[PDB]
Amino acid sequence: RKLRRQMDIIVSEVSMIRDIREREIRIYTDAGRICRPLLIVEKQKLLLKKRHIDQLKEREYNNYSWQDLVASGVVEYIDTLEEETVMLAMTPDDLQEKEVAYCSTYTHCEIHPSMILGVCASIIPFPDHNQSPRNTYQSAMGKQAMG
Amino acid sequence: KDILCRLEHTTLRKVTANTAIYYDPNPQSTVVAEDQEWVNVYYEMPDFDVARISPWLLRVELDRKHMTDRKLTMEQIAEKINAGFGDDLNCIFNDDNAEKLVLRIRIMNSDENKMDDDVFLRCIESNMLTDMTLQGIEQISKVYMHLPQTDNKKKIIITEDGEFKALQEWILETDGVSLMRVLSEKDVDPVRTTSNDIVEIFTVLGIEAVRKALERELYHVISFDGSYVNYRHLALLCDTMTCRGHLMAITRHGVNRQDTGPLMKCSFEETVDVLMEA
Amino acid sequence: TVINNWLLIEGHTIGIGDSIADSKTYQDIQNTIKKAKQDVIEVIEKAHNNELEPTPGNTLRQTFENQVNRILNDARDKTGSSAQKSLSEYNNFKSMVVSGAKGSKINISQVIAVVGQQNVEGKRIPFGFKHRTLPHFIKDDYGP
Amino acid sequence: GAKKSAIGQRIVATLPYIKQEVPIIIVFRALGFVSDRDILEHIIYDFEDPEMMEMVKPSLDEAFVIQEQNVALNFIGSRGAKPGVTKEKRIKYAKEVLQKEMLPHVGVSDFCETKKAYFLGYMVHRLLLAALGRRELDDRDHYGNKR
Amino acid sequence: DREVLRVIFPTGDSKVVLPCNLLRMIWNAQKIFHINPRLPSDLHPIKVVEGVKELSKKLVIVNGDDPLSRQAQENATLLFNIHLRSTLCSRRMAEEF
Amino acid sequence: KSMESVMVKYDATVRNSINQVVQLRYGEDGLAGESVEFQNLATLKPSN
Amino acid sequence: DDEEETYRLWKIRKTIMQLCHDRGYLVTQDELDQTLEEFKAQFGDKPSEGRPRRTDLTVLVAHNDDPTDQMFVFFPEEPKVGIKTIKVYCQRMQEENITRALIVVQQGMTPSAKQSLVDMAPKYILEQFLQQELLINITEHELVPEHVVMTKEEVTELLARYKLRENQLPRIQAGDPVARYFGIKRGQVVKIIRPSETAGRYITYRLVQ
Amino acid sequence: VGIRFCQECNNMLYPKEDKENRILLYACRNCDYQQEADNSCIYVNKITHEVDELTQIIADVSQDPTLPRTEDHPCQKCGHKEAVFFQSHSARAEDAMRLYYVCTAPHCGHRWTE
Ligand SMILES: [Zn+2]
């Protein structure tokens, strides 16, 4: 994990999966693996700090970009196989904050839960207040609209 | 529940906990320590096995809860094995007082006095676990028992005053179809008992019973969601499916069984081939 | 024709105001859902401590799922009825349901009180992940 | 059957470019592992587990007759899609099939038989766990199994 | 007729689908002729008994004087005639209708 | 396909194209489905 | 089990008496209503290896219309009826000059014997009934409606009234469980009477074919 | 239950009986080799198979971050308050709701069920 987060020998898209029960470590480097970026959480804290946000705010005239977040080890890509071994927090402000100890071993956090949606479902306003089939119908209608 | 046991198919596998093919050369001295205590009780006056006995032994443990749940005791299991295998096997079983129920099996003495003395036990052990039947009716995997809370499954009788009273009776539904066997079973209503398999009804009761059963099956599916269809539509379909006296499938398998003109057969399918024959 | 022209005077609409409920009604719904979750937690504790006795015709897993589902099914009904009673005579959700024109009691309750249990093939959401429905839960989490 | 249900359930292998499957132990014999202990060492990694040992008993009996690597290779070659004219050519064809067609991702070099035996034993080991109920069956819908 | 209905409907479900709605027809008759339920009725009970008997003959589903036709005619309109006789009985015509 | 030709003939029987008798009277009562409607038998439920 | 075997044999006798009575043969009312205790008490011993022999259980009945006409019901003790056992029964019919005979079967009937019955079918009518079938009277099942075998005089009137051909009636297979119950051959017509929820009663006619 | 392998060709040893002495012998096939059997049981299968899950449980699971952890069940071996609990969730059980606990203290893989 350390090498991948430092991007030393292991590229970002390499997924390492440990099946603790089965005593197997599976490393996958081939193509075709679907992955998404997730914020790394250590000791119930985000590795993403205000300094990272400040640098991103001056994205231009600063040369700071998304790749520096990956290089800094603050965010990493997780594929579906690795996601089975990941303890994921939906939000930092609520899940890993001190409270009734539902879970104290979060390993990752969502950047935003709304990124689960695709292009056409991402224009629906308040899609969480609609019946799910109606969100599916709009994704179809949005591709037939005029503009 | 007693009637349920006589219907649900129970085999030795269901009631048996574990089985071990112990060598046990000398019956007097048993390899298993605890087994020795009660074995000697059956060996003071051995009968039909004094001449010879197979060196190999087969010890099977019977689950207590399953035996009581099925109302099965140590006796009929030994009788059933002996009855099924005749004199081929000699069965010795312990007493119910012991926390563990045991049943020692050995091959006949006459054969001892051709396939294999050791492998044959495995063939018997596997054969007895599944093929052998303790009590029940084959093809009926599971039987459920419940009291109906709906009038249709309830029993309705006319009282002395002439009113309709719906009694709460126990009704058993099975996961398999053996209508002839179940119907003949004692203490089983030979009138109301029925099946959802049209073929089973056809071969047991007849075409007219199928006509009525098909009505009820067709009505049940239609009325499941609360919808209603006029009876005359239900009757007409069930009449056309049984008009010719045998189960008339609406598929091309049963449609083709119908007798019609050459052009009608073309409309169904296989148009070109039919016309050549005509 | 006659009532389509009287409706020009009476008018009929539906809006956000019809989807709201009283703060007292919201409190009642919250209490029911809070208690229903606690009831499911107790059923989980009984199963975890091997204090749950399977019912006839069902295995332990089926018994637990039946007990959990009825608790959550009852909670949805209890909150659904509570939300319906809060509706006024003027509520337009109720007017369309009462006349039978469109919608039902379940639609009103879902809009106002609780959407309820989601089922796939007649059962609760399966553990598609390894003993998890989503990576955001702990393994073997049978809570609502 | 009388003896069918006595041995139990036996494991076969459907290798590419073979019309009909072959007993699993035969494939191990062809790969160069003759003795039962050597074959089982690649399948059962913990000999203290009686449950696993019993599952392979019927497979061993099925391939009891074949006791030499060349005999096993001829059996594999005999069932090849293009049976050899003579016994010697059958062995060469079977060797080529296992060399390249069988588990190619493990290797294609002439000295990769040991690696292919371990993975093939792992495939058998995984099958036994599924048969024994120790590991859950793989989900086709699980999207980390997809590419 | 009551005993026959019991055989036809052992479950005791009285709802049935029949051609003519007699309860509404009686209700229509009450309104058309301004029947006063409070006052005594001038309808002779025998006219009710005789009237239904004549009516039953007119409601023909299978026509024919032979025994085969008569039995089929009796069967075809059996359920309706039981309903007709019980609805248009003399007692009800004089008590409630 | 099977029921296309089933028809109420002029003798009031229900027959198919082959002219075989499917029902002696349509719906066993010789009535059409439009006019009938639900009613209650008054003498069935009550006591003696 | 020996104890339940007498109960089993009693059921077949009860069904046969009901079967014979339905066919029109003379069966006494008390004979039809024969309780299990009466069947056991009338004989009174252990059934198996005891007093009941399937040859002993054989019964003779006579048609009500024609007293001379009679039917034989033969129960074979062997699990499977053989050719010789069938040959024994046919000779028995010759001695009593009984055209119709009913044969019960315990577990199965020899495939060779099946063709033998057809060969002798014209001179003598023989029917084979499995013991399992007769354990229950299907005619008493709710699904099964009342079946009445129509006489040729009735059938002729039926066709004349409806101006029908025999081919235009609904059909019932001669192997139908109810058809075998009444022993009706091809060309016979069955009058089925069943309740109707639209009409109350409905009579159906099925040609045996 | 014990599986024995030949000492000459490392092949399976199968049970065999010598009528001369009437003693179980594990005789190698295609090896004319025999051994003195001692267990006296050649075959045993448990239909109920009440196999303890604790034996199957691996102590390494305590490192899984996706498992729940409870402080209310201290480890008996060492007294560590924290423990990781889970269900077997393995087929052939038919009822998998009881919790198995594994001590989270490193080097102490104690496993227990309540
Ligand atoms: Zn050896």
Ligand SMILES: [Zn+2]
């Ligand atoms: Zn510890």
